[PDB]
């Protein structure tokens, strides 16, 4: 990996562990144990007990039905897009562009009002973020494929 500094560190640790003596007090301290118990106590960093505590009751079912409809629409559109992929014929080139335009129109029409509604109601769940991840991934894949197509023409 590195230069002879790795051998230097190996020699240093060998010398340090040549004269090794077990310790009793130095193993732990009261402050360290208290901090660890606080971390391991319920509601701590490792023991976060919320984990969408009332997600069944939060973001009420009226939003949930709209969220399911948006999920179904996004799934159908992405299924069409990925069925078009890979683009091996010039005919599918325009179909993918139309699919991207439809995706953008659907996003602007639905998600942006959905984002505004979430912001107004201040939902703690990032429902929009996951949907954006799929759309962002699709956009990145399309851009990469277009760049590769440009590379083949150079």
């Amino acid at each position: 990996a590195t230069s002879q500094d790795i051998i230097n560190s190996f020699q240093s640790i060998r010398q340090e562990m040549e004269a090794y003596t077990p310790k009793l007090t130095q193993v732990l301290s009261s402050s360290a144990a208290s901090s660890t118990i606080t971390a391991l106590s319920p509601g701590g960093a490792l023991m976060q007990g919320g984990t969408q505590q009332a997600i069944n009751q939060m973001v009420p079912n009226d939003i949930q039905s709209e969220l399911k409809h948006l999920y179904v629409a996004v799934g159908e559109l992405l299924r069409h897009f990925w069925s078009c992929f890979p683009v091996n014929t010039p005919f599918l080139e325009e179909k993918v562009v139309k699919m991207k335009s439809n995706l953008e129109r659907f996003q602007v029409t639905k998600l942006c009002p959905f984002q505004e509604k979430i912001r107004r109601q201040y939902l703690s769940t990032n429902l929009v973020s996951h949907i954006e991840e799929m759309l962002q991934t699709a956009y990145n894949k399309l851009h990469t494929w277009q760049s590769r197509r440009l590379m083949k023409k150079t």
């Binding site: 009793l24 732990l28 301290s29 009261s30 360290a32 144990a33 208290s34 118990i37």
Partner: protein, 434 residues
Amino acid sequence: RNLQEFLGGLSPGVLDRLYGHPATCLAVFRELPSLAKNWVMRMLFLEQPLPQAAVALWVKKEFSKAQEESTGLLSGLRIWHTQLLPGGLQGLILNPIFRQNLRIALLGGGKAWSDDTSQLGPDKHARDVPSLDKYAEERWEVVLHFMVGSPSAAVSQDLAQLLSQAGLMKSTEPGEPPCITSAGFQFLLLDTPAQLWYFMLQYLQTAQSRGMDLVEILSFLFQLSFSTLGKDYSVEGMSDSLLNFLQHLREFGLVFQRKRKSRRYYPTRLAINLSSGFIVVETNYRLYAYTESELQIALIALFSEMLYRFPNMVVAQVTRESVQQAIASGITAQQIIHFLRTRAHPVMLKQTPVLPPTITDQIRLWELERDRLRFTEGVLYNQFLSQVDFELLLAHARELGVLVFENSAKRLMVVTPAGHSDVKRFWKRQKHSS
């Protein structure tokens, strides 16, 4: 009775003094439940108390009963104490002395439990582990034979008095040898580690008569429990009172010592087990024991019929008559089953359960035969002219706690002979008052 039962009944000062020895703390810790040990280990490095709710939330709701039992046992043993945490809350923190001694016993620190061993060098008359085991077995067999009363067993008068104090044997007439009681038979049927612990508990209870410190004896016993087999220790460093206890243990076979004035003592296998197979059982009610000593032969013949005695084998048959005779002698079926399970041959350990269910069920059914009929002496009242009169007398008898049987349909009641006079006086007064 176990160690926890004895420790619970001790005063807080005695418990605090016991924790001053690192060996005692470890022995108490190993007797805790599995859940309690984890709590003790978690709180080992804590200098501040924790809320009771925080401790309670560690265990799930379904297992709250075990958590409550463990907390109650810890409170009874006074391992930790509730602390008045500021803000109205109750804080739980381990006893500082117990925690320090436990850390010393685990991490290290201070001096060794024993003074030294190489000061006198190697032992001139050192023995071997098989020799120590043989000596311990011979001493235990001698003690148990003296319980029976055979002339081949000769022990000290103090041991005989202690056995009499334990209730195992009674001396109706002075001079004549004592006779073993039914409790003696039950104790004989008990397992050897159980027998040792019961004897030690009796000794601790009666130690106040001899003016011996309970704390020192308990600490020394716990130190002996963790001692390494085959390694001797220095007698010096103990009070003269502890010397008598050590001599008594040597008489009991727990600890080997060549001479009373010797500075060395070798703990035996029995001493190590104080902290806490040869019988083959067949479905045809036959016991095959791989033993030669007369002690096991007598123990088996107590509740079975002997058939053959090969030089290294005993073939006996468990019959209904023999079990009935043994039960009439005072031994319960549960003790017999436990004894058979404890002495079970290693081959039988493969079977699940080790003892065949049919044999245990048959033994239990044979036990119930003797007590099929229930006998309760008393006086019967059946001359009630009115239903209301019967109810008042029945209520009065129940208040006196002398009622044995009642039948409201036929207005029949049975009272104890002791309470008959009181009920008769009450009935006479009621008629006079009417």
